């Protein structure tokens, strides 16, 4: 996980748990201890500026891989990346896990681009509860104007009425 | 900062240092450096 985060290519905890059968508590404690001793060795040796490489969220780096798992086109992926970037401004979902934020942004832009993929398929592919995805879409329906890229709706490729209401 | 052209969609882009080399319109990861703006002299022989 540290090697994935350092190369700006970070996977999630679920990925590493899918490969390595390790309990969540011991893996988190081990990650914390190794981050502490890595910072200590950096201070003792060559000091390294983090510049958002040990970032806990890193939700911009999950959008292309998660869109590839669903077989989405690129413009859906960049719209989802913009939506996930603008989701940080929303204080109601700022505490959500970045996997859930990425998934609800992807699902919002799937409904925006009329891609025929159901919430059940997104939940099955990315192992997020369908109720969680539906609640995230419901809580993001009030902020439709800020999340959707203004230049996309300006060019007319997508329109805000395509999103079903709650 | 520096001008580039995507290899397949031929869209002019401006990339800085921190920007990942990737087209913003079609996503092709092969980018060509823009031809220089200075005039270059050739002997016609």
């Amino acid at each position: 996980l540290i090697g994935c985060r350092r190369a700006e290519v970070a996977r999630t905890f679920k990925e590493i748990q899918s490969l390595i059968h390790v309990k969540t508590k011991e893996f988190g404690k081990t990650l914390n201890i190794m981050k502490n001793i890595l910072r200590g060795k950096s201070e003792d040796g060559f000091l390294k500026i983090d510049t958002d490489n040990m970032s806990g969220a890193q939700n911009l780096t999950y959008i292309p891989r998660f869109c590839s798992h669903l077989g989405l086109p690129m413009q859906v992926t960049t719209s989802a990346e913009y939506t996930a970037k603008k989701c940080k401004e929303i204080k109601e979902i700022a505490g959500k896990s970045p996997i859930t934020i990425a998934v609800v942004s992807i699902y919002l832009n799937i409904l925006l681009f009329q891609i025929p993929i159901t919430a059940a398929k997104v939940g099955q592919t990315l192992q997020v509860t369908e109720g969680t995805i539906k609640s995230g879409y419901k809580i993001l329906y009030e902020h439709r104007d800020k999340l959707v890229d203004p230049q996309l709706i300006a060019n007319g490729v997508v329109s805000l009425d395509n999103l079903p209401g709650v | 900062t520096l001008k580039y052209i995507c290899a397949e969609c031929s869209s002019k882009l401006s990339l800085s240092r921190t920007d990942a080399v990737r087209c913003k319109d079609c996503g092709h990861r092969i980018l060509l450096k823009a031809r220089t703006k200075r005039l270059v002299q050739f002997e016609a022989r």
């Binding site: 679920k14 899918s18 490969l19 798992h69 669903l70 077989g71 192992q127 | -």
Partner: protein
């Protein structure tokens, strides 16, 4: 039916009601050894067919001993029904037919009384004097239906080409390597079925545990840590504190690495 060979105790009389001698009264029957083409051997050897019904007639023209088969129409219509039985040998020597039937198990001069002989009932079905081969007739209208079928033998391919996944490659690679999809199969979940067994016990008092150890030592003199632990359901630290007082481990005997009662308590 596995059985010992070279038995001089005549044990086969008691265990096998059927006689072991070869039956020879059927050896005088005449048997024609016939080689068939692919279709007649396919339809004349299947077990879902051949219920004893008649399959044809044999015509033997005595002008030149010409043998023909006139098959019945009950089998097919596309196949021919007139065939020629060519004889490649009018007299076939040293060829017989023997059959084997399972027995009924219910109700120099130096010799060894063990040769591993499998006793099976044997009977000569008859004598073979004619090696036969069945050709389709030239004049049959269905004869070409054989030949094209033979031309269908070399034409068809028994192997299919590889299947190409035509969907998006990302959907195919979603399940590969790094995936959010945790494995839900139960194949070889050895850690699931072995780490779920946990033993919990208390510090139950000394007199009852020593009486329990004496009961197990009376049942059998030699025991181990794990067997006694699962028999009495006690912690290892408490069980060890009671074993060394009344018992000891064997270090050099044939029953080594096992806890046994002390020689002072052995006569008790």
């Amino acid at each position: 039916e596995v059985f010992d060979g070279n038995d001089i105790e005549n044990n086969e009389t008691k265990v096998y009601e059927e006689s072991l001698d070869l039956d020879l009264e059927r050896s005088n029957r005449q048997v024609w050894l016939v080689r068939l083409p692919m279709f007649l051997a396919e339809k004349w050897r299947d077990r879902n067919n051949l219920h004893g019904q008649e399959l044809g007639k044999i015509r033997i023209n005595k002008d030149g001993s010409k043998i023909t088969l006139l098959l019945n129409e009950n089998d097919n219509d596309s196949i021919p029904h007139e065939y020629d039985l060519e004889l490649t040998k009018k007299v076939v020597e040293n060829e017989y037919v023997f059959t084997e039937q399972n027995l009924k198990k219910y109700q120099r001069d130096r010799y060894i009384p063990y040769v591993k002989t499998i006793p099976k009932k044997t009977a000569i079905v008859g004598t073979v004097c004619h090696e036969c081969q069945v050709m389709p007739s030239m004049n049959d209208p269905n004869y070409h239906k054989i030949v094209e079928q033979r031309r269908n033998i070399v034409k068809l391919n028994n192997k299919e080409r590889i299947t190409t996944l035509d969907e998006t490659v990302g959907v195919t690679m979603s399940h590969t390597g790094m995936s959010m999809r945790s494995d839900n199969s139960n194949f070889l979940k050895v850690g699931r079925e072995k780490a779920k067994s946990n033993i919990k016990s208390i510090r139950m008092p000394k007199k009852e545990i020593l009486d329990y150890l004496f009961k197990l030592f009376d049942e059998y003199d030699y025991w181990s840590l794990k067997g006694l632990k699962e028999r009495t359901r006690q912690p290892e630290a408490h069980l060890k504190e009671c074993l060394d007082k009344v018992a000891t481990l064997v270090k050099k005997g044939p029953y080594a690495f096992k806890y046994t009662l002390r020689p002072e308590y052995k006569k008790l």
